[PDB]
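Support request, please re-run this one:
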Amino acid sequence: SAYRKKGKGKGTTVGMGKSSRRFINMYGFDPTEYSFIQFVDPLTGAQIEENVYADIRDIQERFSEVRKKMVENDDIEMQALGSNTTIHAYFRKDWSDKALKIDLMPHNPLKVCDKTNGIAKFPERELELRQTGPAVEVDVKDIPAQEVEHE
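Re-run finished. Output below.
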């Protein structure tokens, strides 16, 4: 008697795969809104936030600071004092695209006193506050503005 059972020969087919995937997502936004009139002085260059119902009481209050530093700094003597009425009003375009520059004056007109030839004016009446000058429209970026610089 005799027997031979040779074999038991099998194999294995294994196979895996690396599953690695990167991803990058980021999006910001600068939601800014501003609708008002920018007040500025022609003399030096004061700055104040005025609106449709801007009250002189306010503009005069903050103005005190500007004028204070001006005279304090000691730069002039009567350059600013010589004239203190005309104000520069900076308006903003409808779509805040361009910037309008219009100057305005107070409602306190004066007159000259003299008892000798006091009629050196043209034949007109109702002489009231007239337009001191035309308006200047220029892009906020166009005008000489100290654009903020990134840190």
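The helical segments are 56-73. The longest strand covers residues 98-104.
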